[PDB]
Structure 1
């Protein structure tokens, strides 16, 4: 059924653009992902049946949380697709498969709870994974689906390449732990300003992929303002529900997760743009000039938040 899906020709044009918003096309998301894999990686590299099977299983293991859900997975994969299409030749074919798959799978089985929560309230997952808690779990879920019957889309890879693609996927998913981003962007920016960055240097290459994963993960801020606004609602719906569980336990949450502090949201976004998103896309545009429209769109939404703060 996914196997016989064909993308409407109007989308074939729009999907290539960074600002493309998948939201209005829920029924088409699995088929959008196939399309993107076929365009980037070619039509002959995965068995169609397996890919579709794998996709429908990835969907099934995303939970119905307000933000970290199937819609989010596809949004992040789409941003990567546009990054890759615009920078096709800088990356190996193996990196394109892994990085599209990693993005689809990067928040697999998210409960609507942060790493801090699981750590603070000594959740089992935080016992198995001490840092990048959920992110290690997300990868562990990725491998588990790959290992299901008729799901191993990489089964025609040699052993060497299978373990290469898993490693690209592992690093990529871990990179989506925002705690790791700040150090990553700092190094990458220094490597850039000192003329020392080298894409054939593998550790550098891992870092650039890291920044890409971040840039994809945050990409709500690069959509048109009305889509940006509406996604923020999803983000805070999930944060506030976590802060609610903390209050039930007589723990005052951080303001970000306290629905009683929503007046502080516009300034909370403002800060996030200044400390996180603007710098991300700034360094990303430096390394990969064709990704500039992400920074442009990010800047436009920053100034919308600046407008909001002052009664506009």
Structure 2
């Protein structure tokens, strides 16, 4: 109850910044996460014993894939932490509670394959969930872990508060389906431009939280260049494995997943920053002005990929 979590001075200062890297020491990531919940939510949001046991069950249910792993989960939660702290008064006690949990849980039991590969393989999960296949699985794995004995971090909540928080987590995790991002950003773009955007409209908040989730999920593009560059290696190492598997089913994979088109990665990053990342942080900066550093850092990394293409690295 009187037990603060603290971090070494460099982490204590740098963790508050959007571009923070959680580092290569796996055993400090649980502590980093608890630090963030305590500062974001209060030391009283969760029974510590239950929270610690929830974090370790979540960790155990991420797999050793190159990118969609426990490190990604904590990175995405840290980005959400920075957004929530730079926008203190815009968010409910329930949202602050739900959204950090949502980010930690959002890729639970990922196998390193896209929804498209599950569908062409005919994986049982593609029969149970026709759209946002992995994302419905991620929410389903979240609920399972919440129902393990001693794991109900939401036990203090009322019956209807509990239902509201699980509904925030569900929509948050569904919104990490990048297929849904495009339409969601377009709608938020037009609502903001016609002045109809209203944060008391629950369906408007949903879209905004949706965009925050895309922003947090893509946050490798908002880091220091060497972090950004080394994460792209992990991202492609999954995609190329999936490409190999596509070829094993006798299907030419899209270029994104073809290791034979390695040389075109820089140009693929350009497309991605222009088609997805820049638009995402642009619209997010408009709706939440204090998130501008994510847009600024995304633009800087775009410029670093331009440099790679021009032979300047």
- 2:134 corresponds to 1:134: yes
Residue 9 of structure 1 and its aligned partner are, at CA, apart by 2.8
Residue 12 of structure 1 and its aligned partner are, at CA, apart by 1.2
For 1:112-147, what per-residue CA distance to the aligned partner results, in whole angstroms no more than 9, with x for missing partners? Answer: 110001112221101000000000000000000000
Residue 267 of structure 1 and its aligned partner are, at CA, apart by 0.6
Residues 1:284 and 1:209: Cα distance change in structure 2 (over 3 Å): same
Query: What TM-score, normalized to structure 2?
Result: 0.97
Residues 1:2 and 1:247: Cα distance change in structure 2 (over 3 Å): farther
For 1:237-267, what per-residue CA distance to the aligned partner results, in whole angstroms no more than 9, with x for missing partners? Answer: 0111111112222221111111111111111
8 A Cα contact 1:3 1:48, kept in partner: no
Residue 4 of structure 1 and its aligned partner are, at CA, apart by 8.8
Equivalents in 1 of 2:4, 2:171: separation in Å? 33
For 1:255-292, what per-residue CA distance to the aligned partner results, in whole angstroms no more than 9, with x for missing partners? Answer: 11111111111110000000000000000000000000
Three-state SS of the structure 1 residue aligned to 2:26 is helix
8 A Cα contact 2:139 2:173, kept in partner: yes
Equivalents in 2 of 1:117, 1:210: separation in Å? 24
Three-state SS of the structure 1 residue aligned to 2:62 is coil
Name the counterpart of 2:226.
226
Residues 1:104 and 1:3: Cα distance change in structure 2 (over 3 Å): farther
8 A Cα contact 2:222 2:298, kept in partner: yes
8 A Cα contact 1:50 1:152, kept in partner: yes
Equivalents in 2 of 1:94, 1:291: separation in Å? 21
Residue 23 of structure 1 and its aligned partner are, at CA, apart by 2.6
Residue 88 of structure 1 and its aligned partner are, at CA, apart by 1.3
Residues 1:105 and 1:26: Cα distance change in structure 2 (over 3 Å): same
Residue 13 of structure 1 and its aligned partner are, at CA, apart by 1.0
8 A Cα contact 1:3 1:52, kept in partner: no
Equivalents in 2 of 1:6, 1:26: separation in Å? 17
8 A Cα contact 2:101 2:169, kept in partner: yes
Residue 3 of structure 1 and its aligned partner are, at CA, apart by 8.7
Name the counterpart of 1:44.
44
Relative to structure 2, which stretch is displaced further, 33-42 or 192-201?
A: 192-201
Residue 19 of structure 1 and its aligned partner are, at CA, apart by 0.6
- Structure 2: segments with no counterpart, 5+ residues: none
Query: What TM-score, normalized to structure 1?
Result: 0.98
Equivalents in 2 of 1:237, 1:170: separation in Å? 29
Q: Pairwise CA RMSD of aligned residues?
A: 1.7
Relative to structure 2, which stretch is displaced further, 272-281 or 23-32?
A: 23-32
8 A Cα contact 2:5 2:35, kept in partner: no
Residue 309 of structure 1 and its aligned partner are, at CA, apart by 1.0
8 A Cα contact 1:139 1:170, kept in partner: yes
For 1:34-75, what per-residue CA distance to the aligned partner results, in whole angstroms no more than 9, with x for missing partners? Answer: 000000110012100000000011000000000000000000
8 A Cα contact 1:3 1:49, kept in partner: no
Residues 1:37 and 1:101: Cα distance change in structure 2 (over 3 Å): same
Aligned residues: 312
